[PDB]
Amino acid sequence: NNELLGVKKLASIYRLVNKYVDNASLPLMAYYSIARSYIGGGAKTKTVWSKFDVYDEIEFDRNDFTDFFQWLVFLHNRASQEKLSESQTTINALFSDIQSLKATLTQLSADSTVIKGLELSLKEKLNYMKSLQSGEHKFNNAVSLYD
Amino acid sequence: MNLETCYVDFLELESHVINEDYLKESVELQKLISTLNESKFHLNKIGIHDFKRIRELQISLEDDLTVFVGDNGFGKSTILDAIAIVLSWLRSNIEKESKPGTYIKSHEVNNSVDVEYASIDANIKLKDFNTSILITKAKEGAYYSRNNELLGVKKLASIYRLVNKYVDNASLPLMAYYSIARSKTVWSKFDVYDEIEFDRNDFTDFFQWLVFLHNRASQEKLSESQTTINALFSDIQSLKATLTQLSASTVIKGLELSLKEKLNYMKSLQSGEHKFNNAVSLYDSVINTILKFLPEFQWIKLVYGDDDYKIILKKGEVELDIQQLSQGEKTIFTLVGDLARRLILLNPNLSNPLLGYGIVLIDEIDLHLHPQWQQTIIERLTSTFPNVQFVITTHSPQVLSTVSSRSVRILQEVEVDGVNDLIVSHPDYQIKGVSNQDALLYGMRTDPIPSTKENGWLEEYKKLVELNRYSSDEALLLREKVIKHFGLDHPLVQECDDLISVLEFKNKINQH
Numbered sequence A: 001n002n003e004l005l006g007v008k009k010l011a012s013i014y015r016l017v018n019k020y021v022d023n024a025s026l027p028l029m030a031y032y033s034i035a036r037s038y039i040g041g042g043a044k045t046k047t048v049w050s051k052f053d054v055y056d057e058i059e060f061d062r063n064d065f066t067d068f069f070q071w072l073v074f075l076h077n078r079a080s081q082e083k084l085s086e087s088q089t090t091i092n093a094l095f096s097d098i099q100s101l102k103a104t105l106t107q108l109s110a111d112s113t114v115i116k117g118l119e120l121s122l123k124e125k126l127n128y129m130k131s132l133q134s135g136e137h138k139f140n141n142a143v144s145l146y147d
Numbered sequence B: 001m002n003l004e005t006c007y008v009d010f011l012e013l014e015s016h017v018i019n020e021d022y023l024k025e026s027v028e029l030q031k032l033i034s035t036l037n038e039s040k041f042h043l044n045k046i047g048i049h050d051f052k053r054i055r056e057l058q059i060s061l062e063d064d065l066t067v068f069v070g071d072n073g074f075g076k077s078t079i080l081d082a083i084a085i086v087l088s089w090l091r092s093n094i095e096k097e098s099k100p101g102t103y104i105k106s107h108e109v110n111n112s113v114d115v116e117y118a119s120i121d122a123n124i125k126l127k128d129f130n131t132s133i134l135i136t137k138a139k140e141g142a143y144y145s146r147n148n149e150l151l152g153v154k155k156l157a158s159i160y161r162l163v164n165k166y167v168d169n170a171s172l173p174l175m176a177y178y179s180i181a182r183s184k185t186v187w188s189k190f191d192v193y194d195e196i197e198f199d200r201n202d203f204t205d206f207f208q209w210l211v212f213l214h215n216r217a218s219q220e221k222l223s224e225s226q227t228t229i230n231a232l233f234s235d236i237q238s239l240k241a242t243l244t245q246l247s248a249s250t251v252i253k254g255l256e257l258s259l260k261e262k263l264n265y266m267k268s269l270q271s272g273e274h275k276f277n278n279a280v281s282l283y284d285s286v287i288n289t290i291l292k293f294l295p296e297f298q299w300i301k302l303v304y305g306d307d308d309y310k311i312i313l314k315k316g317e318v319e320l321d322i323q324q325l326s327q328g329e330k331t332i333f334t335l336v337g338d339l340a341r342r343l344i345l346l347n348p349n350l351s352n353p354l355l356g357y358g359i360v361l362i363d364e365i366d367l368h369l370h371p372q373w374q375q376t377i378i379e380r381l382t383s384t385f386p387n388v389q390f391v392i393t394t395h396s397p398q399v400l401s402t403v404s405s406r407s408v409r410i411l412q413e414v415e416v417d418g419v420n421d422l423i424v425s426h427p428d429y430q431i432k433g434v435s436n437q438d439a440l441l442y443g444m445r446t447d448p449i450p451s452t453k454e455n456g457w458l459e460e461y462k463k464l465v466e467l468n469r470y471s472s473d474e475a476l477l478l479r480e481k482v483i484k485h486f487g488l489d490h491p492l493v494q495e496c497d498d499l500i501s502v503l504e505f506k507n508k509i510n511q512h
């Protein structure tokens, strides 16, 4: 007979902690046999991913390569969506205001004009942009993951 | 301004002038285009001879809407297939001169003893210009009606080839046929114009097409376009920074530089190709068209979540996944999406491409639809695209109550001189706004009340009551069955009791 008390007990702890934790981590197990040479040497569209998708098999072969390609494009589009929207608004406001200051300094033309007010507006925009950052604080965690 | 008169003189001018640019900009071309754009394309008449169950018939079609009502095996699908056969040849000639169209299948010929050939005739009227096309096939008859007469359609095809050869971004008529189950050249978008026939209940394919188009649209918004907007992000700022806060001669000197920068920024836009319905412009136009068709929704967008991606529709204050929709809404969604997709691509010059011209054939519109949906589909179809001709066949009486009586045709079967042939009639009343059963009785000639066995006792009890024999023992026995099946409070019993009381009072007065 086989003795499976230890594995059953250890796995029960992982399932219990996974029950009460939103994004609990799991150990990584993999095996790259000699058949990987033509895994890269040589269906319904997937829309849902999960950490248990990698747990179907312990070995690497065939369709895993295909899934990598489908996963990569999913990451790229996620970055592109976050590149647009409100992040572009701060891009337009902060750069133009900074450019407005820089040209004036370069121009050296002639109440001190409105240079102080422009600098104050730039400082306010920079402070708001810094406060708006969330998560990894570098475009959330999508662009950084792709790079 | 006759089309023929403008066409002949433009052809003569083109022949006289060898140079293409000389005739490219001239009064003859402008006159031809101007009179071509105001013409309204619509079919006028059709005749059928020895085709399937139809022996000999001539049908006149309306200019905006026409509804065919009939039973099973009455040739409703025969008429639509005949029109598709006629339009196939015109489409083939438009694509290329001297190209075969669709032939008549051998099994489609009538199986009568004395038949020899089957012929189809059609008439297309464009403002004042008229044309007619006849296609015929003989199975085994010794004498046939010569060959197909395609002379009329070749002139029209050459007209369209001429107009679109010199001036680009022209317009073409729309021909579509939404059939039943059965079963370069703007190909970058993947829409296929080669096939006239299209099938509904293919929501998966349209969903994937929408997702791929959205990804291409998002890709085009970046890269070199992001550079041009960056330049515009400073010229407008300079204009404001030079004319807004310092209003209160060196200060005015910078305005010339700012205007020079604006003109230089205009150089990049000048070196830009025409939109030609690019990926960005197609997406918003399609989405807005669907939103216009269904005003109950606020917006539609594709959301890439932390792990998944899906399309979210908002109505009221609730957000629904696209997959939560029922079968009827999916069918409407793909039908409107395909119509908008074809209309946008076929009219790249018009400011509002939803004002094109064409003919659309729909078979069994009421398939997979709740009765609450059937009562508003016609008004929305006829209001979203106001310049298209529709030919529709239907089975549901609920749809009929929303259609004017001037666009209703009824197919019957009558026998004349020992030969049974089909006939077309018209309703004798106005059926727009009437109740459901009135529409069923007048527009379909069917009994609205079933002939169930439980009904059999009802009329017998009524008849006994009307003959002043309600006190008879037979009536008393029958009342037990009726009152047991229906109940005391049912309105039908209540009116019967009212009649009983009225007759009793009349008998009391007469007796005294």
Ligand SMILES: Nc1ncnc2c1ncn2[C@@H]1O[C@H](COP(=O)(O)OP(=O)(O)OP(=O)(O)O)[C@@H](O)[C@H]1O
Residues within 6 Å of the ligand: B052, B053, B071, B072, B073, B074, B075, B076, B077, B078, B079, B107, B108, B109, B110, B111, B112, B180
């Ligand atoms: N070769 C033929 N000769 C004579 N009659 C034919 C022949 N082929 C078919 N028919 C007739 O065609 C009739 C059915 O025609 P059709 O398909 O137009 O009917 P429909 O009820 O309008 O169709 P649908 O449900 O597709 O709208 C049958 O009743 C049959 O008698």
